[PDB]
């Protein structure tokens, strides 16, 4: 087997790749799609909730870590949850020692440092969770996407997960309004993005969508079926 | 003791007495408080002798490490920093006052003092020890700026002579060192040479 | 005053081709009297005996760890322990706890296994080794036995004379102190016989 | 060639799957069928005994246990694995009743248990812990400030609020039946009747008193495991 | 091909070579291209950053870091590797300042970071840092130095070097430039045109140029090129690239 | 306790007492204070006797290992460096006053470590409780660059003044002489005071002591 | 630090309309003895915040080294954010409280001030963690002497002019020298404003010996 | 050789009304005979129906408040629910006993709303003991506020009086008069007062000055 | 404090005042001394109030764990020994404890006294606190093993009031509990003044 080079993260391919890292990268492609948008003063995280069966609740994909910073997970439940407790502990430690919120860029930098150790050292499996980070700090809203290759990017938007290329090309079609949009406009743009991800037979129902919005004065608040109801009342109809 | 070191244009002159006692009994009257830490950086030691020698060997090792890694002699600032951190990290257990005198090509002759408790500071004259509470007025009255090597020598001779004749914790001989670009000159004053 | 907390009295003697070791039998707390069967003299061999002075329980502990380590050495080597090795061994056993010192001042005596030359040694609380060609005492009666063994001992002393000298010395020395007394055990060991006795002194 | 990735939990498939975790998941189907249903009046837990011998003491085989008087449990998988899980859950509930002196919610119960779970690939196992994924699927039900609540726990550490979930050997079929037999307004008595109906349709043998363990948790009373007479009463109707 | 020898970094080859560091070489040569040039009174850095998606914000994955106030950080390879190496280098510089009380020389920092990256090269439970990074500084009493340190662990002194898919290409067109005399003002132009000519437009398009420098022009302080000088460099590039 | 040390024209001479006291009562009159470390270096201890003994054997073993690994004769600076490092390790908790003197390829050397752990190189130095009398002689009669036999009687009268001016020293004198081709371990060098003759026999003959019981155990 | 060897003079802090003013002497005093007379007890940490100190200069240099490392890291990540004066106040409080709680206290009465986003901050953490934000602060014997004076000058007018604040701190240092023996005739003024932090000094003292002529 | 605990005084009064809790403090921050600053409130809001108030070693006060906010943060993150007043009380007891042999030198008083919209005041001994009360004063003037509140609010040692309940304005005038008395009586307190009321709608605050002397 | 708990043929009672003082000033008069740790097992109060509350809440956690693990109710003897050991490792660095472990289990109604010093002693009559001797006198004058439920209640109230009356560090309210095979019960809580009126004549 020529793929004896993908059994641990500590071996390189003959062509200079770490195939285990690439498999971890592709792992988050399995999870459900999730797209985020940010305005002049407001950043939104909208995700597509999934359920094991219709007789049970949908899997939460938007996680609250601190009043100003919020995360969205796509990938392994275990790794994402561990990253979430790590995020909460670090945000609290920052609030305790500096009395200031953890910067989005600094938080994502420590996330990268934490998740690089499994990539570099034998032992812990690489953190195979795609994280969408949306928060607020001195220069306004930020959207940070932390790829499971222990890499992160400052993005205007990103959709990570299953069939996320459709949302990616939707946002590629629709940059020109993201910067100047208000809450409702950006929310409807994100909903159209997920609807692009979602196939024809399915639609963004109340139980299907999860919306998280942060801003300058508005904390990272996550909406649910009853809470997403006013935001989806302004939503248009699917252009089918 | 009385370790007074004063810098001049071109380097620094450092002097000390030669008295070490365990109680009222003079244990050793040939004590040298000037321990060469490197080729062109020296030190002046006050307080408990064992601590001063131990930290002297430790910093000798550390700046030897640094000088051999950079292939360049250390700056006085780095050395003084090593003494500062060493003193602070043991300040609850360290009873030792160190004067870091020396010359380096980067700036020239520098006097750095780390007294009891570990102030990393620099100044013109660095007088230390139990005998440094007597000549302070004497140096302040005899302080002038820019003593040549001869004038620095006389400043040292007279100042440590007043410390010698006035204080009972300073005795024996007077040891001097002159550090410059030419190198280091070490001289000793005894007999009729001390005023 | 730690020595006075239990007390004791031991003495070691040698003669011509024989050894005599004597020890007190009293056991009692710093003020009150309890028993008279305390063992201060211990057999480290067929001709090796060690006398201990210090806290009673400290004495027993050091004796037991000594016996353990000595049987270990004897099993490792298969040979009888030559008494200078014993003195260095006991010095190490005391010293290895310098910061936690056992307030115990022991003593040893014996003979060389090959040439049958008697040897005695003295040890300090923190474990200062010391050897004498004449005599050694430890316990609470150090001054009196020291002085009267200085005034009584003679070199090259015959075995029967050795027993008589040790008996008289130990009895007339223990007549001068109270915390150690009320029965003394005397062990004379020669290369041919081991006569274990207990001289009749005062029971007071 | 999957074989290079099943060996060990810290391996990633070319499809990014955790094959060790998937094997642990499938190992749940080795356990007996457990069915829990959530109703406004409470939650009831029904399980299969799978008694190996009539000489067995039925009290020993435990498919439903009590973590606290207000909460209930159901098991499917390894007996010892679930034993450690349940002991940790009880220790955690007493930890909460110590720290906050309150009754701790079932979602937080499954949170803490899942915290003990999903820790197999964690460096904190140096003192000693799971080097392998926990091999039992957990069914948590009870009443808290949000009324009656039932949560299903996945050996991977995932949890979901489920109105009616079935775990064990017949999880697929029992879930399919519960899909159409469940209504939101179902009463406790009719819910338990439906649950025993599903067990009868699912279980490999006939339903007798020694084939089913039954549990109920309601806001009124505490955790009650159906006794022999209560089991007979609830089974004579069906 | 060495099969049976390159599964670990502690195993030599029959020819006597560790294939893990050679594979790290291969990975670096399969990475982006970064050039640096040391001027008369400072050093400058240049990064060719590919915008993989316009969705990415500008300044994302910033690659010209600064380990210390007077020390920059250019690097090519894995961004996670780059950040981890930058973090350990920053901790090393902070420890040097805490213990020795003055700025860290570039050569000494390079030696320490090379020793640390070697410590990850020769173990079996870890992997060599498959990223090549640049060290640049300007000290008024020491001078200007530049260093390239690859995952092989060798920290050699280069006047101005490049790393990436156009290593030899950038060598060919940086050799023709005369270097030792002009300062940053007359070196930023050359860096800009060099970076804009090494990049391939038919394949691996969509790149932007970011620049940084250290020297007395900012008082021995590393910082990104000012926006005015940045657009001036871009204008000289578009004029010179014709 | 008295320890003294001088450097003469060619080597080192060491003088040590033999009286060991615990409390206010002497323990032994002929203790050995000149301690064997190397066939070319020697030390004298003072203070806590057990501490001096154990530190001397420890440094001698470590220095023997050092010399055997090197194959060269050990140097005084090496021995004193390890000695002072280990003395300062305990920070005065050991009451061990030691003086170290020997000969190396660089010449004779003589160092003195106080119990707290400080040292200094001296052509002539003494320590102990009787250090006052010895150092007074050291300033009174000592001469540098001074021959071997005159070194011997110099040290002998210095230690004699120590014993006759202090209670804690005497009853023997032992000297150690270090040279590039000579090691003279004089022990005892000269007894200064022999115990007086006993005038009266206390008549310890047979039958003077009664016994309780008899028990006979043959061996060999 | 269980035995203080080197102490600090009074550190005066007043927030005026336009920034913050700190003054302290160069008296690095070994007990009562004026061991040093040219040590700058005031030194800035960043462009928008600064700090002066009293107590042992050793832990003060420990702190300026640590905080300088933190702020160089802050400007090293290049994140735009800087430690707001609230942030330095919080770090000092938690760090020195924890340092004390392990019975190794930082014997330093600490003054922290700053001018950010148009708002003036003036915090003071003591030897033991008692910290607050107030318009006027003083340390050492300053809390006894000038703090009542600053309170009097602020009770009727809490806002003070830049020249008014400068003359106020000069007069407070004057009365400090008049009534305290742990002061030197030289003080550093630190004025942190919108345009930044600036450190100046020193100035002398003049005693009206009319006390001497009518005491005779 | 060192004192880790310096006295700082303070007075924390918490009267829990019928459908509200009224929690009060004085913003005087002074040590021994020196005064640090007259503006330093001793009231700390935790959540919309729970507000902590603590007095004693001021560094211990601020560290305690930060710790309780941190524990609140984990409780909200994990249990997804804001905890009750009794939960915060047990939290305080646990955290205070966690440093039992190095005691947190602080008098803690917590006031908030119970789950039925009922007043909740928990008196906290610095050792860790806690009780449920409708009223409690602590710090430096607890001994003098206790009996007046007993006779007027607790209806103690008074007869021929209808056991009337507490009101909003009635308890408001109550607490105002009791702080006027407390400031005019004790020299260790003064320079300000802070009064906080928490009821069904939320929390309210008001500041009244007092004698400067 | 003052706690009395004596065993008889019908069961065991417990006594408790409610006065909490810090030196001279009474910290509180509404202190619940005896702790309702477990519905069938009762814990008392003495020494450090928070020490007692913490240790009894630890013991409550431990017995809940035991009854949930072994699926059987913990013995009173087991609980008393558990308290003794769990506080013993804390002996010597500042613990202040005195406590009675009272409850009825399969071996009859049990009562053991645990303390910071180290005694875990059983026995019929247990009195600890400031007014321990005052309660002991009246109880031993009135102790008979045959106290019937109503007369046991009457003599219980008599002795407990005598204890809370004769002491100077005691006062406030009174806590009284009785243990039976179905668990413990809160019998009554009579104040010092009302019970003063009742027992004056």
Short mmCIF file of C-alpha atoms in Angstrom, two decimals, chain B residues 34-137:
data_model
loop_
_atom_site.label_atom_id
_atom_site.label_comp_id
_atom_site.label_asym_id
_atom_site.label_seq_id
_atom_site.Cartn_x
_atom_site.Cartn_y
_atom_site.Cartn_z
CA UNK B 34 37.23 42.45 42.47
CA UNK B 35 36.59 39.16 40.68
CA UNK B 36 37.28 39.16 36.92
CA UNK B 37 34.08 37.95 35.29
CA UNK B 38 35.42 38.23 31.73
CA UNK B 39 38.26 39.67 29.64
CA UNK B 40 37.00 43.27 29.92
CA UNK B 41 34.06 43.10 32.36
CA UNK B 42 34.62 42.97 36.13
CA UNK B 43 32.53 43.05 39.29
CA UNK B 44 32.58 44.47 42.82
CA UNK B 45 31.14 42.34 45.61
CA UNK B 46 29.60 43.37 48.94
CA UNK B 47 27.67 41.43 51.54
CA UNK B 48 27.84 37.70 52.25
CA UNK B 49 30.94 36.45 50.44
CA UNK B 50 29.70 32.96 49.55
CA UNK B 51 26.67 34.33 47.72
CA UNK B 52 28.84 36.81 45.81
CA UNK B 53 31.30 34.14 44.67
CA UNK B 54 28.53 31.70 43.75
CA UNK B 55 26.66 34.23 41.63
CA UNK B 56 30.02 35.32 40.19
CA UNK B 57 30.74 31.81 38.91
CA UNK B 58 27.16 31.46 37.67
CA UNK B 59 27.29 34.68 35.65
CA UNK B 60 30.82 33.82 34.50
CA UNK B 61 29.33 30.66 33.01
CA UNK B 62 26.37 32.54 31.53
CA UNK B 63 28.24 35.38 29.82
CA UNK B 64 30.96 32.96 28.75
CA UNK B 65 28.15 31.03 27.08
CA UNK B 66 26.86 34.22 25.47
CA UNK B 67 30.27 35.49 24.37
CA UNK B 68 31.19 32.15 22.83
CA UNK B 69 27.84 31.86 21.02
CA UNK B 70 27.93 35.39 19.60
CA UNK B 71 31.70 35.20 18.99
CA UNK B 72 31.52 38.72 20.47
CA UNK B 73 32.29 39.99 23.99
CA UNK B 74 29.20 40.78 26.08
CA UNK B 75 27.81 44.23 26.71
CA UNK B 76 27.76 45.60 30.25
CA UNK B 77 23.96 45.88 30.05
CA UNK B 78 23.51 42.13 29.52
CA UNK B 79 25.85 41.25 32.39
CA UNK B 80 24.18 43.70 34.77
CA UNK B 81 20.86 42.17 33.74
CA UNK B 82 22.14 38.71 34.69
CA UNK B 83 23.20 39.96 38.12
CA UNK B 84 19.84 41.73 38.50
CA UNK B 85 17.78 38.62 37.75
CA UNK B 86 20.03 36.41 39.87
CA UNK B 87 19.72 38.80 42.82
CA UNK B 88 15.95 39.21 42.50
CA UNK B 89 15.22 35.50 42.08
CA UNK B 90 17.06 34.88 45.38
CA UNK B 91 16.39 38.27 47.01
CA UNK B 92 14.53 36.55 49.85
CA UNK B 93 17.73 34.56 50.51
CA UNK B 94 20.47 36.72 48.94
CA UNK B 95 22.41 39.13 51.16
CA UNK B 96 24.81 40.55 48.58
CA UNK B 97 25.41 43.87 46.86
CA UNK B 98 27.19 43.79 43.51
CA UNK B 99 28.72 46.57 41.41
CA UNK B 100 29.02 45.70 37.72
CA UNK B 101 31.84 47.81 36.31
CA UNK B 102 33.53 47.26 32.98
CA UNK B 103 34.17 48.51 29.48
CA UNK B 104 32.66 47.31 26.22
CA UNK B 105 33.18 48.46 22.61
CA UNK B 106 29.46 49.18 22.21
CA UNK B 107 29.34 52.21 24.52
CA UNK B 108 32.50 52.31 26.62
CA UNK B 109 33.05 52.32 30.38
CA UNK B 110 29.88 51.58 32.32
CA UNK B 111 29.19 51.30 36.04
CA UNK B 112 26.13 49.26 36.99
CA UNK B 113 25.14 48.77 40.63
CA UNK B 114 22.81 46.16 42.10
CA UNK B 115 22.61 46.95 45.84
CA UNK B 116 20.73 45.01 48.51
CA UNK B 117 17.37 43.91 47.13
CA UNK B 118 18.34 44.26 43.48
CA UNK B 119 18.13 47.73 41.95
CA UNK B 120 19.56 47.40 38.44
CA UNK B 121 20.86 50.96 38.06
CA UNK B 122 23.82 52.87 36.64
CA UNK B 123 25.61 55.92 37.99
CA UNK B 124 28.95 57.71 38.25
CA UNK B 125 30.32 56.34 41.54
CA UNK B 126 29.14 53.01 42.91
CA UNK B 127 30.14 52.69 46.56
CA UNK B 128 29.02 49.60 48.44
CA UNK B 129 29.27 47.68 51.69
CA UNK B 130 29.12 48.65 55.33
CA UNK B 131 31.89 51.16 54.62
CA UNK B 132 29.79 52.93 51.99
CA UNK B 133 27.89 54.89 54.67
CA UNK B 134 30.94 57.03 55.49
CA UNK B 135 32.60 58.33 52.30
CA UNK B 136 29.27 59.27 50.69
CA UNK B 137 29.65 62.82 51.95
#
